[PDB]
Subunit: 229 residues, 2 copies
C-alpha cells in the first residue's frame, strides 16, 4: 500500500503504525523500531522519504511531541487516573502543585530512606506524596499495612511509621478486614500492571505529561527530577 | 553514584533503577528523552559503558530488559480493559493470537481489513475480537445496535463485513439500554487509547508489549499483527 521509499525504510526494521499530516506538503508515517517511536516524512516529489526528526522554527522537536502524544501519553494518562482513584494516603499539603505516587510496604527499608529524602519538598508545600500501601515483602506486611489502614488517622500513622523507621508500636487487629483486604488487593494489582515489584515504586509526570518511574532509592538527579525541580 | 555513571547522567540520562548484571558488573536502567538506556559499571569500578549487552546465544539482553521494564507494563491495563469489554468473536476461541479491533458498521477500511485477516482466522491461528462503536454516520449507532441485537451477533457481524455492508438487517425500534452501554463503553475506551481513525487495531508483540495499527495495514504490518 506504501510509496516505494517508505517500503525501503520498512525493510530496515521499522513497523508502520499510522499515517499523519505533516507540514510543507509532506505526508507523515509513524512507526516503531524495537518499540521506540519513529517518524518518516515523504517528500513533495513523492519519490523520496526521510526517516528522522522534524524541528520547527521555535526549536521544538515535533517528531518527539507526536511520538509522545500518540504512543506514550494515552497509557500514562490512564495509569495516572487509576492511581488518582485508588485509596492513597496523603503526605503533605493537599494543594501541593507536584503530585507523586509511591508504592510502599511497611518492611521496606528503602521506602523509609526515600521518605526522608522527600522532607524538604514536602514540608515546604511543593510536593505531595500519595502512598499506595501494599503488603508483599514480609509475612507480616499484610497485617501491618492493614493495621495502619485501620487506625483512626491512617495517613498520620503512616508518617509516624516511616519517620520512626518502623519502630512505631501499633494495635494490630485480629484479622485484615474486608475493606482493608480490598485496598491492599487493588493496590498490588495496580503495582503489578506498572511492572515494578521492587520498592519504593515511584511514579510522577514529566513536563511533557508522560508518566515516568523510579524504582528503589533515587540518586540526587532522579530525586530532584521526581520532586519537580 | 559512581563517577563514570554521573558523567553519563550529564549527557541527558535519567536513571530509573539499578539492576544486577553478569560478570561483576552493576547495571543502571535509564532514559534519554523517550529512549530506554542501559549502563554497565565495569569491575574496576572506574568506567561505565552505555550500550547494549548481548549473550552467547545472541539475545540483546538490554532490549529484553528495556521491553520488560519500560514497555510491557504500559500495555497491560488497556489490554485487560479490552478483554473485559463486550467484544464479538471471529475465529476459534482457543486461537493463540488475539487481535482487538475497534470498528464501525460504516467504516470502509474496516471491511478490507476483515478480508485481509481471513487466512489467519480461518486457519485457527488468530481470533479477531471486535469492539463495535457507532460514531461515523448518523445511522452508525442504530446499525451497530441492530447487529448486537441479532440472534448470533458475532455471525451477523462477520456476514455484514463479508458483504461489504450490503447484508440486510432487522432493525429494532430503538437501541436497548444494554446495547447503548456497550457502544458508549467501547467509544470511551477507544478515546482513551487515542485513535479515532478506524480500524483501530490492538495486538501484542512477541515481547508481550501492546502495539497499535491505525487504518488499513500494509502487507508488512498485517503480517506482524497476525503473528507471523
Amino acid at each position: 500500500e506504501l510509496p516505494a521509499p517508505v517500503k525501503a525504510i520498512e525493510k530496515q526494521g521499522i513497523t508502520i503504525i499510522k499515517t499523519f499530516d505533516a507540514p510543507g506538503g509532506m505526508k507523515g508515517y509513524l512507526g516503531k523500531y524495537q518499540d521506540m517511536g519513529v517518524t518518516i516524512y515523504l517528500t513533495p516529489d513523492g519519490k523520496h522519504a526521510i526517516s528522522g526528526y522534524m524541528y520547527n522554527e521555535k526549536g521544538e522537536n515535533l517528531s518527539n511531541t507526536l511520538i509522545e502524544k500518540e504512543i506514550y501519553a494515552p497509557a500514562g494518562r490512564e495509569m495516572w487516573q487509576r492511581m488518582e482513584q485508588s485509596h492513597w494516603l496523603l503526605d503533605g499539603k493537599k494543594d501541593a502543585p507536584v503530585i507523586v505516587y509511591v508504592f510502599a510496604d511497611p518492611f521496606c527499608g528503602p521506602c523509609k530512606q526515600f521518605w526522608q529524602q522527600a522532607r524538604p519538598w514536602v514540608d515546604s508545600g511543593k510536593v505531595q506524596l500519595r502512598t499506595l500501601l501494599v503488603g508483599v515483602i514480609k509475612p507480616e506486611s499484610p497485617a501491618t499495612a492493614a493495621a495502619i489502614l485501620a487506625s483512626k488517622d491512617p495517613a498520620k500513622t503512616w508518617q509516624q511509621y516511616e519517620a520512626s523507621g518502623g519502630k512505631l508500636k501499633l494495635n494490630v487487629p485480629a484479622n485484615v478486614s474486608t475493606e482493608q483486604m480490598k485496598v491492599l488487593s487493588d493496590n498490588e494489582k495496580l503495582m503489578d500492571d506498572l511492572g515494578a515489584n521492587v520498592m519504593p515504586a515511584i511514579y510522577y509526570m514529566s513536563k511533557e505529561n508522560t508518566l515516568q518511574q523510579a524504582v528503589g532509592l533515587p540518586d540526587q538527579k532522579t530525586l530532584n527530577i521526581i520532586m519537580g525541580n
